[PDB]
Ligand binder design. Structure first.
Ligand code: MAN
Length: 36
């Protein structure tokens, strides 16, 4: 899972897409999504 302020899963990202407990994957940009 991705940590707080980490890139969860935007377009082009293939790593830890599921955010940690208490954080939501906020799509800041189509490619940049951050666990907030
Ligand atoms: C991601 O996996 C779980 C998701 O809730 C977290 O509890 C864990 O700490 C890790 O960051």
């Amino acid at each position: 899972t991705q940590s707080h302020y980490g890139q969860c899963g935007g377009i082009g990202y293939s790593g830890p897409t599921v955010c940690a407990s208490g954080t939501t994957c906020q799509v800041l940009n189509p490619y940049y999504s951050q666990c907030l």
